[PDB]
Structures are given as C-alpha cells and as structure tokens.
Design a protein around this ligand. Structure first.
Ligand SMILES: Cc1cc2nc3c(=O)[nH]c(=O)nc-3n(C[C@H](O)[C@H](O)[C@H](O)COP(=O)(O)OP(=O)(O)OC[C@H]3O[C@@H](n4cnc5c(N)ncnc54)[C@H](O)[C@@H]3O)c2cc1C
Ligand SMILES: NC(=O)c1ccc[n+]([C@@H]2O[C@H](COP(=O)([O-])OP(=O)(O)OC[C@H]3O[C@@H](n4cnc5c(N)ncnc54)[C@H](O)[C@@H]3O)[C@@H](O)[C@H]2O)c1
Ligand SMILES: O=C(O)[C@@H]1CCCO1
Ligand SMILES: [Mg+2]
Length: 1211
C-alpha cells in the first residue's frame, strides 16, 4: 500500500520567491494591504489637479448626453415592463414571423395570452435588471401574470409589437456585438475606422461536461481563424484579438484537479495560442474566481516558457485590482516576461466576482477575504498597480480596463506626455464604455486608443455574462450608475480615492457592514475556522501534518471512570484500502457498559454541581483544542471514515460549532432550577463520526449530565480522540466515559437501570428498538426517559423548468454523491419536470463522468469508499432489486485501484413511482422521477407519503412554486436553489419529523432544554400569535364554569411559541429562516376531566389537533363543543389505526404512565415524543406539559445569490 498522503497535493512546480510573495498576500488584513498601495498611488499636486480637470471635462461631456422609452410611452409600471419583455422573448421563439404575427393579432391581443403560450417568466430576473436596475433572486410570477394581462387588456396589439421589436434589438445589438463572429467582425468597422480596437469573447464559461469544453474549444478555434483573417497582419496592437476563459476549456478547472488541468487543459490553450501567434493576434486569458488565480499562473508560466510561442508578444493575462495579491501577481508577470523573452499584455481590471467572493470566504470560514471590502480600496489598488505597469512598459503592455472617468484621468496624466501606439491602451466593455471613450480616442480628444471587449453569441451562452454587466451597471457604488444619479455631483465623481483613503482615521479599515468569517455571529460566539485548499502554503503544511497523522498509533479503549478496560481488540482499517491500518480498537464488554452507567450515576451530583458557565467554559476550551488540532484530526477522519479533505474540514468545523453553540446557549439559559436528568447515553452514527458524536455529548455535558459515549463500531478512533480532547479541556473522566463496540454495547447502555436519558442518531430501525426498550423504564420521579432519536431520510429535490441546469447539476452532484451519499441529508430522489428532464440528465451524467473515486488521501479524490463490505453489499442488493424490476440503472466506472477497499460507484436509477422506494438506501444511489407540471401537488404528496421528512430541496425561480411547495412539503430542513446538505449550527438547525426524527433539532435553541428536568425559555423563543381554536376552547371552558381551566388555557395560549418566525444570522447571499409550526395530531391519554382540559389546552395552544383515548371514558366532558374546537378533536379506540401521531400527552400515576408508554412504543410508524404527568402535577404545575415539545421546528435556507448576484450587497 502506498504511504498515506505521500501524494496529497504536490504543487505544479516548486514555488519561487515571487510566487510565495503572492500566496502570502492571499488573505492579508485590509489595514496591511492599503498603506503601500496608497504610497504607490500617490501623484504630485500638479498631476492631481490636472487629472481632476480632465475627469471633470469627461463627466461634463457624458452628462451632456431604450426600454425606458417604451415604459414612458405606454405608461407601464415596472412589473408591466418586465412582463412585456418576457412575453416578447417568448414570441421571438416562434421562428415564422407570419405565424407569430397571426398569433399576436388573433389570440394574444384579445384575451388570455396564457391559453396560447415552461413559465413565460423564467428569465424575468434578467429583464427585471434591464427594466429597474435591481436584481431579485426569484420572480413573483403571479404579479407578472397580473401585469401582463393588465397591459395587454389596456394597450392591445401595439404594445406587444413594440415589445417584440425592443426585445429583438436588445438581444441582438445591445447585449452582444454580434450573434456570430462574422457579424461581430462586420459591426466593428465603424469604431475601428475611428481608432478603437476589439477583443472578441465567444461567450462561454464553467464547462460542466467534456462535451461542453470541446464545443467551447471549437468556438475559440473558429473565432481565432476568423479574427486572424480579419486582422490581415495588422498585429497585436492595432488589429483585433481574442479573450478566453480557462473554465470554458475543462470541466474540472480547479487546484484540486491540478494534474488534470496541466495534462488536459494546458495543451488546448497552447494550441489556441499557437494559432493566435500564427495570425499575430492577441490572446487574453480572462481572470475568474480568486481560488483560480494562482493556478492560472502555472498555465501562464508554462505557456510563456514554451519556445513554440517565442517571437510573439500577443500572450495576454488579466489581473484583478480588487484582489489583495494584485501587485505581487504583477511582480511575477513582469519577471516572467523578462525570463521568457517576450512582452506580455496585461489587462488591469477591478473585478467581476465581488459578491461571490464575499459569500465564499464567509461560507468557508477563512481568515479574511481575498478581495477588498471597500470600493475605494479597489480604486486605490488599481491606481497603484497602474503605476507599476507603467514603470515596466518595456516588457509588459498595460491595458487599463475601466469605465471610471476619475480612474482613467488619473492614469492618463500618470502616463506622461510621451505616447506611442503600443506603449499602453485603455479598454472598455461593448455597450458600456463607448460614450466615455468617444471622449478619449482620437487626435481631438485625449488621443489614446481603447480596445472594446466584444461578447459574441446568442442567448444560449449569454446569461451569466449579461447579469454581471447589468449588476455592475445598477450597483450603487459603480461609476456607470453614479454618473446617471443626479443626486451625485461631479465634485463627488472626481474625488481622488487615494487622498480620501489617506485621510481616513484607520487606513484600510474593513467595511463596517461586512463581517469577517470568524465574526458571522457577532458577540454570541466565534465561528469555526476552515482551511483554504487553494493556498499552497496551507497545502504544504497540511501535507506534512497529514503524513504525520498517518504515522500515529491511534487507539480507542473503553475509558471508564476508573480507567481503561480491556476487551476484544482489533485493527481499524481504511475503508478505501484495507491494507492501510489506521489504528486499534478495544471494545466494551456488556458487563463493563453496565458498570460505566453505575459509575456515571455515582459521579452525577459532582458534575451537576459544576456551575453552567464553567461547564460551558469546558466546551469552549475543547473547541479551541480541536481548532488547533484540526490538521491532525482531518488526517484521522480522512483515513478512518472514507472522507475527502473537504468532507473532513466540514466535520471538524461542525464539532467546533456544536461546542461553542451549546456553550453560548447554556450561558443564555441554564440556572439552578434547570436540574440535570442524570446519566445520559449518547449513541452516534459512523457517517459523521466526530461532529454528531461531539454534538450530542457536548449538549448533554453542558446541561449538567454525565455521559456514556458509545460511538459507531466503524469509527472508534476519532471518537476516542474527541473524548481525549474533552477530558483535556476539563471534563472529568467520571463525567465522560467512552464505550467502543457494536450495537450490543449500545443496547446494554440503553437498558441500564441508572440511564436517565438517551441521545440517539442513527437508522430509524435501530431507534425503534431503543424506544421499545426505554418504554419499560421510568425515571425515579415516575416519568418517561427522554429520548432524542434523529433518524433516516428519503430526501427529495424538485426541479421545475425555470431552474438553471448548471446550478441544478452542481447541487445534485454535491447533495447525492458527496461522501458517497453517506449523509443523512443526502439527495435520494431527484424529481425533474418532464420537459427539462432529458437535458438535465444528460448534463448530470456528463458531470458524473468527471468525478474521481478512490482512496481519500489525495486532494484530487472527490468521492470516497463506503464504510464496510456489509454496507457495500446492502447497497448493491438494492441496486440489484431495482435492476430486477427493469428500472434503468446507470453507474460510472471505477478504477482498478478501488479493489483493495469497499467502493460503490455513483449510481443513477430511473423510477416509475416514488413508491418503488421502500427504505433509506445509505449510499451513492440517486433515484430519478419525471413529473408533469400539473402533477406538482400530487408529487409533493408522494414525497410526504414515504413517512420521512428530513431534508428537501426546491430549484425554481418562481415565487408561486416556492410558496406552494414549501407550504405543502413536510420536512424539517428546506433548501431553495442550493444543495440540501447544509447543517450549519445555529444557522440551519438540523433535524426532521416523521420517520426522520423526534426533535428537538440539534444545533438549534430547543436542544438543551430536553436534557434537563425543567426546560428553560430559549433565546428569542416567543410568539405574539394566539391560536384561535385555543381561544374558542377557553371561552367554552368559561361558559361551563371551569374557571381555573379556562385560565390555564389562556395561559397556554400566551406561553405558546407557535408562529415564531425568525431570520438567523449567517453568510451574505443566503436567507436562513427558523419557524415553529404545529406538530400535527397529538395522542391524548387523559385520566380525569381536568386532566383532559389541560392536555387539550396544551395541544390547541400549539396549533395541533388531537385524538383522545376513547377508553378514558371522558366523552361526556366535551359536550356542546364549539365547532371550531370539535373540528380538531377525534376519539380513538384503536390508536394504531388512527395514526400517525406527532406526539402524545399522558396523565396517570407511574404505573399508568409506563403501561401507556409501552403501548405507544408499539404503535407503527414514527417514534412519538411523549410527555406524562400525574393528576396532582397537572393541578400543581402549569408547565406539567411543556409546550416546547408540542411545536415542530422548520429550517429553511434560501440561496438569494442564485440569479447571479447579491441584491443587498449591490448597496
Ligand atoms: C474591457 C474589460 C475587461 C474586463 N475583464 C475582466 C476579467 O477578465 N475578469 C474580471 O474579474 N473583471 C474584468 N473586468 C472588470 C469588471 O468586469 C468591471 O467592468 C469592472 O470591475 C468595473 O470597474 P470600473 O473602473 O469600470 O468601475 P467602477 O464603478 O469604478 O468600479 C466598480 C468595481 O469596484 C469593485 N467593487 C465594488 N464594490 C466594492 C467593495 N464594497 N469593495 C471592494 N471592491 C468593490 C468591483 O470590482 C466593481 O466591479 C473587465 C472590465 C473591462 C472594461
Ligand atoms: N437525523 C440525523 O441528523 C442523522 C444524522 C446522521 C446519520 N443519520 C442516520 O444514521 C444512519 C447511519 O449511521 P449508522 O449506519 O451508524 O446507523 P445505525 O442505526 O446502524 O447505527 C447507529 C448507532 O446505533 C448503534 N446501535 C446499533 N444497534 C443498536 C441497538 N440494538 N441498541 C442500541 N444501539 C444500537 C450502533 O452501534 C451505532 O453506534 C442512517 O440511517 C442515517 O440517515 C441521521
Ligand atoms: O466575464 C466578465 O464579466 C469579465 C468581464 C470581461 C471579461 O471577464
Ligand atoms: Mg450499524
């Protein structure tokens, strides 16, 4: 077996001094970046005065001179303008104008456009940007439909015709320079005669499949031939050139795939560069996301050092001045030019991905942003980098891309009075910069050339680039926007950002309204930190720490309060390669499991006496220890549990977040009256072997309970290391005991007499057995043993014809095949609307064939093994049964190296009905169903009908579909236009309903209260809403003289948090929502009339209906019930036939409570959260039944950056 991590992530080449200087600046503090930029950007008072004059002149000329005119002419509202353009766009898809015109004149103009015409409004977000300048992530299609009907009924055929002509002209003339390269070359002559030049971009980026990359390659190749022939030997300065995006040329363009990039992408760029050289035209590599900057430099370096490209100065490269590495990148490029004997064209830009970079750094928990956070900082950076470029015009050709008249004038005077063509040039984007550069090019203006970046193509490739332009055009900080804002004066426009920054009290201070990733949660807690796997320093130090982790002799032992116990001992083997021994585990005898519980019971008063803030301090220290040890922990998780590096980072971050979140929740809530339960048994799954392991233990400890920690049999080593860390942090040995072993060890703990509570995460099947065993037991107070049982999923994603296919496929690949599908949250059923299913499935299969499956100690591995042979056989048996029914089953091929481990390839199975699935299949197996749009409501029924309710995804841009689907789906974690595996602690509190969970959600504010005998009031836990049926019940109680019960009912109505509706703090570009709903139908088992009244008040106040045990004999107690209340009330003789229920309320003595609890455990379907109280307790304690457990939590995470940008960050 190869040495673990020996080939984890070797760099493309050894990092030079100049390359290292780039990497060191990647996330440098903004206060450190700016002072040297300010100094480099400084110009004399003479130049500053001169530049202000020129800038003012330019702005005066621009201010001294489309859809807006169409809106004015027909008095359209904004929504009417958007709807009109959507209609026009659709009408233009009719290829025969005669057919189109007849349809307009005879069907659309008089009556419902709907009857004669996939939503009309799939592209409304884009038209919304065109019409209003604002971007919304999703569209209100009911408002747009209303507006379209209104404008047609008002204005008839003439406005439709104007809309069609206006759409035609915009999509063919304004959005692009031409739809084909030949047409774009024709239209260039007018401005070329005037001294402009051109750089053409065949629109295209982010190849998803091999076929995508090949098509984009062929477009670039055809364009170079056409541009080269048009250039006709004009050369790289006066003749036209081409721009390319590297992400267009390979479906896996990333640092993680560097070997494939250098072996497969580089030769394609070399071939194109060879053509560009042969025609002597410029070829420019566009700059993209920040995590691709340094990788693109390796391609630039190999190209520039290639002798087949010598004698040609047309190699070009963009550097983004909004990036912190920009000046150091320029130092590298200038030196590369000297080393390679060429002149390199350098396009200086600000940058096009700002919103996405802010969101990405926050999601990833990194030290800082790789871009500036104040716009003026970007301006200063640009000026300072222009100074560097102009000092080296002998070896680079500076190309100053900007629409900012102040920026332009600063550089124009910086460059001095000596100019010749070829010294430097300006650049602008087609349809944006011509008015400004009409004031620049020519002997009668500034006499400086400008190259126009010219997008070429049709709507099929237009979207992404067009949105970026429109966002740039409408952003309130953008020059092209401010120049049209009459509220913005010219003196403000010509303000020198270098002097404004120089005069600030803290030079380079971060933007006040953008949180660093560590600060996402403010004063409440510190966010866990990740690791940047695109940073070469990080990859080199990680490589060494990971190799060192593989040399450690990891062990896991039964760690009882008295010390480690002996037992059956065996090796722990890497699931991806059984030759790789990871460590040794000694497993717990059933007798020692029972002994551990007695020891926990003896130690329980000592741990409960540790005050809550000091218990929380233990958790916070443990989080610091894990953060510091993250590199080592990653290596163990990678080798023990089949995880990739990214998977393992998420695992450790999640454990850190649980620790700090439950610590903070404890400091917010727990006091002396919130007594611990006693010894708590924590039983955890293999698939999140540190995160959920740590989360359950940490919550139980901080609530004051000693813990018996029973990790899954497959993954004991990381659990032992987690226990070592918690003990190191101050948890006493007697308060936290580790009991490795199989399910028999779990069962022995669950059954032990002093066990006071059980926290279980695992399969629904095992949870049912645990609930059965617990129903035989009672606390010494005569009440049920609390059980949190978070179980399996059958998770669906619904995709309609308005979704963006590329985005769907990325989120599907992640949701279904991340960790080989071994997430409880994993996508199991992809539901595709029929008319887009084939296209999406073709793209999905193409993306599947680009995944690398193998042993996970290489950065290039995407998908790891399944945990055991047993798991592998269980998965393959399902795939066989599906094959046996004639279902189409497709799999990707596995390399022969996977033979020493247990791997299952990503598998796609086409179903006929959702009922084909009978059970959670915990592996890389995605099932697909197609649906007709009119069947959407019934499809949601079919998803709900499995009985599960964990995660659920919806991809749509239509608000009506979002509203419909999210009001009808029954799942605990919802995700809109993103993947469905998010579980960020305190942001997406995670946990489901039905067969998926009892609740309360891990990582949410109700969790700790289940682990004490008297639950606290969580932060922000209240509601001003009062259930109206509860109100009617209280009135009926008053009407029959039951004054004390009516009072209790009104008190329950107020205390209920039903209707809570909160936005949780999280990253930008996302809205994370947390709401409290009714649970459903509650089984009521009363003993007395007043007991029944109290149970009814509790259930009604929380929005529930009820089934009352008919054997109670209390039927006469509810005569003359108001219809509103009776509508919520049924009587049950056979509880099993009237389910499923969502909880239960029991009244009786200890004997009755146990008898009822056993019968409830016997019920089919979901595990029920049961609450019990004696008659005297109901009379004495108004909180005898806790309303926390009668509501259901729902988390919803909405990607609001999905349409292309961030609307709040546009401000
Ligand atoms: C011909 C041409 C080619 C280009 N090629 C590329 C390319 O290959 N890759 C690429 O990424 N960009 C590229 N750009 C730049 C990008 O597309 C925008 O056009 C450019 O950033 C706008 O800058 P400005 O001087 O026109 O306008 P301005 O209004 O002066 O500057 C706007 C810019 O400031 C930045 N910014 C906005 N808010 C903040 C903030 N809060 N904190 C820090 N910075 C902020 C953003 O970069 C924004 O685009 C190109 C631009 C042109 C004209
Ligand atoms: N709802 C959630 O948040 C969530 C999170 C992660 C995983 N899961 C679920 O966990 C499962 C995967 O983990 P797993 O394969 O390790 O599950 P599992 O049910 O096989 O095993 C879970 C744990 O229970 C123990 N166990 C087994 N039999 C027992 C018994 N009779 N009595 C007491 N304990 C017993 C196991 O040893 C292990 O520690 C999947 O079903 C997955 O969906 C749910
Ligand atoms: O694609 C973009 O938005 C930038 C601008 C032109 C090239 O890269
Ligand atoms: Mg198991």
């Amino acid at each position: 077996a190869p040495a673990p991590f020996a080939d984890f992530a070797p760099p493309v080449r050894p990092q030079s001094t100049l390359r290292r200087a780039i990497t060191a600046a990647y996330r440098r503090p903004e206060t450190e970046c700016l002072p040297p930029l300010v100094e480099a950007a400084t110009q004399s008072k003479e130049i500053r005065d001169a530049a202000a004059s020129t800038a003012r002149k330019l702005i005066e000329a621009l201010r001294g001179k489309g859809v807006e005119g169409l809106v004015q002419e027909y008095s359209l509202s904004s929504q009417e303008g958007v709807a009109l353009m959507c209609l026009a766009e659709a009408l233009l898809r009719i290829p025969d104008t005669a057919t189109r015109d007849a349809l307009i004149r005879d069907k659309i103009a008089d009556g419902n456009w709907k009857s004669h015409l996939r939503s009309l409004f799939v592209n409304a977000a884009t038209w919304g940007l065109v019409v209003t300048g604002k971007l919304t992530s999703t569209v209100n299609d009911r408002s747009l439909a209303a507006a379209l009907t209104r404008l047609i009924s008002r204005c008839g055929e003439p406005v439709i015709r104007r809309g069609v002509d206006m759409a035609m002209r915009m999509m063919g003339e304004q959005f692009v320079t031409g739809e084909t390269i030949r047409e774009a070359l024709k239209r260039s002559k007018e401005l070329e005669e005037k001294g402009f030049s051109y750089s053409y971009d065949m629109l295209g980026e982010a190849a998803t499949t091999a076929a995508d990359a090949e098509r984009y390659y062929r477009d670039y190749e055809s364009a170079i031939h056409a541009i080269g022939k048009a250039s006709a030997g004009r050369g790289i300065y006066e003749g036209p050139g081409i721009s390319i995006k590297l992400s267009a040329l390979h479906p896996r363009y990333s640092r993680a795939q560097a070997a494939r990039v250098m072996g497969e992408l580089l030769p394609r760029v070399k071939a194109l560069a060879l053509l560009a050289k042969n025609y002597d035209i410029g070829l420019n590599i566009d700059a993209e996301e920040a995590d691709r900057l340094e990788l693109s430099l390796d391609l630039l370096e190999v190209l520039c050092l290639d002798g087949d490209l010598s004698g040609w100065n047309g190699m070009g490269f963009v550097v983004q001045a909004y990036g912190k590495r920009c000046p150091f990148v320029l130092d590298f490029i200038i030196d590369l030019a000297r080393r390679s004997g060429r002149r390199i064209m350098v396009r200086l830009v600000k940058g096009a991905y700002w919103d996405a970079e802010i969101k990405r750094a926050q999601l990833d928990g990194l030290a800082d942003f790789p871009v500036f956070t104040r716009k003026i900082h970007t301006d200063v950076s640009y000026i300072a980098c222009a100074a560097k470029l102009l000092a080296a015009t002998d070896v680079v050709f500076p190309q100053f891309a900007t629409h900012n008249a102040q920026t332009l004038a600063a550089i124009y005077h910086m460059a001095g009075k000596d100019f010749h063509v070829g010294k430097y040039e300006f650049q602008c984007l087609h349809g944006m910069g011509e008015p400004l550069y009409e004031e620049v090019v020519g002997r009668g203006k500034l006499d400086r050339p400008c190259r126009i970046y010219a997008p070429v193509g049709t709507h099929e490739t237009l979207l992404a680039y067009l949105v970026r332009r429109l966002l740039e055009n409408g952003a309130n900080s953008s020059f092209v926007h401010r120049i049209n804002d009459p509220k913005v004066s010219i003196d403000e426009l010509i303000a020198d950002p270098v002097e404004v920054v120089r005069a600030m009290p803290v030079v380079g201070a971060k933007h006040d309204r953008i949180a660093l990733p560590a600060e996402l949660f403010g004063d409440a807690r510190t966010n866990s930190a990740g690791l940047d796997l695109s940073n070469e320093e990080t990859l080199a130090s990680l490589t060494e720490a990971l190799r060192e982790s593989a040399a450690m002799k990891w062990t896991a032992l039964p760690q009882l309060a008295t010390g480690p116990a002996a037992g059956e001992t065996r090796t722990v083997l890497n699931p991806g390669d059984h030759r790789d021994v990871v460590g040794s585990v000694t497993e717990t005898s059933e007798e020692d499991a029972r002994r551990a519980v007695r020891l926990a019971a003896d130690a329980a008063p000592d741990w409960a006496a540790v005050p809550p803030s000091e218990r929380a301090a233990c958790l916070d220290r443990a989080a610091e220890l894990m953060q510091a040890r993250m590199p080592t922990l990653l290596g163990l998780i990678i080798r023990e549990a089949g995880k990739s590096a990214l998977n393992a980072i998420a695992e450790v971050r999640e454990a850190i977040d649980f620790l700090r979140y439950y610590a903070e929740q404890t400091r917010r809530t727990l006091g002396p009256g919130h007594g611990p339960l006693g010894p708590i048994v924590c039983i955890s799954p293999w698939n999140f072997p540190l995160a959920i392991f740590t989360g359950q233990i940490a919550a139980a400890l901080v609530a004051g309970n000693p813990v018996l920690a029973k990790p899954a049999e497959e993954t004991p080593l990381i659990a032992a290391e987690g226990v070592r860390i918690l003990r190191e942090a101050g948890i006493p040995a007697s308060a936290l005991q580790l009991l490795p072993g199989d399910g028999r060890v779990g069962a022995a703990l669950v059954a032990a007499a002093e066990t006071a509570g059980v926290m279980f995460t695992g399969s629904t099947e095992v949870a049912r057995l645990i609930q059965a065993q617990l129903a035989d037991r009672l606390s010494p107070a005569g009440r049920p043993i609390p059980l949190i049982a978070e179980t399996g999923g059958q998770n669906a994603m619904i995709v309609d014809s308005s979704a963006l296919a590329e985005q769907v496929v990325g989120d599907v690949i992640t949701s279904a095949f991340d960790s080989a599908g071994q997430r409880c949250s994993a996508l199991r059923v992809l539901c595709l609307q029929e008319d887009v299913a084939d296209r999406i499935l073709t793209m999905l299969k193409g993306a599947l064939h680009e995944l690398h499956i193998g042993r996970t100690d290489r950065l290039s591995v995407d998908v790891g093994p399944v945990i055991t042979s047993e798991a592998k056989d269980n998965i393959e048996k399902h795939i066989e049964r599906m094959r046996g029914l004639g279902r189409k089953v497709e799999q990707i091929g596995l390399a022969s190296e996977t033979g020493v481990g247990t791997f299952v390839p990503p598998t796609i199975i086409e179903l006929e009905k959702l009922s084909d699935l009978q059970r959670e299949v915990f592996g890389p197996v995605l099932h697909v169903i197609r649906y007709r749009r009119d069947d959407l409501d019934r499809l949601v029924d079919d998803v709900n009908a499995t009985g599960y309710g964990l995660t659920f995804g919806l991809h749509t841009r239509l608000d009506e579909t979002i509203a419909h689907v999210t009001s009808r789906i029954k799942a605990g974690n919802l995700y809109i236009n993103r993947n469905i595996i998010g579980a960020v602690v305190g942001v997406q509190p995670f946990g489901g309903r039905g067969l998926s969970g009892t609740g309360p959600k891990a990582g949410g504010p109700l969790y700790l209260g289940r682990l004490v005998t008297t639950a606290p009031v969580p932060p922000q836990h209240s509601s001003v809403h009062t259930d109206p049926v509860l109100l009617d019940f209280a009135k009926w109680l008053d009407g029959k003289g039951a004054r004390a019960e009516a009072e209790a009912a009104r008190n329950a109505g107020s205390s209920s948090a039903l209707g809570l509706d909160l936005e949780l703090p999280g990253p930008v570009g996302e809205r994370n929502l947390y709401t409290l709903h009714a649970r459903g139908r509650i089984l009521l088992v009363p003993a007395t009339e007043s007991g029944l009244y109290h149970q009814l008040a509790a259930a009604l106040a929380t929005g529930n209906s009820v089934a009352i045990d008919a054997a109670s004999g209390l039927q006469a107690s509810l005569k003359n019930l108001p219809q509103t209340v009776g509508l919520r009330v049924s009587w049950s003789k056979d509880w099993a036939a009237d389910g499923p229920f969502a909880g239960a309320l029991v009244e009786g003595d200890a004997e009755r409570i146990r008898a009822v609890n056993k019968a409830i455990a016997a019920l089919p379907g979901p595990l029920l959260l049961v609450q019990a109280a004696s008659s005297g307790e109901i009379a004495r304690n108004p909180d005898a039944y806790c309303l926390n457990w009668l509501v259901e939590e729902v988390s919803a995470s909405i990607n609001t950056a999905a349409a292309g940008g961030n609307a709040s960050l546009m401000a």
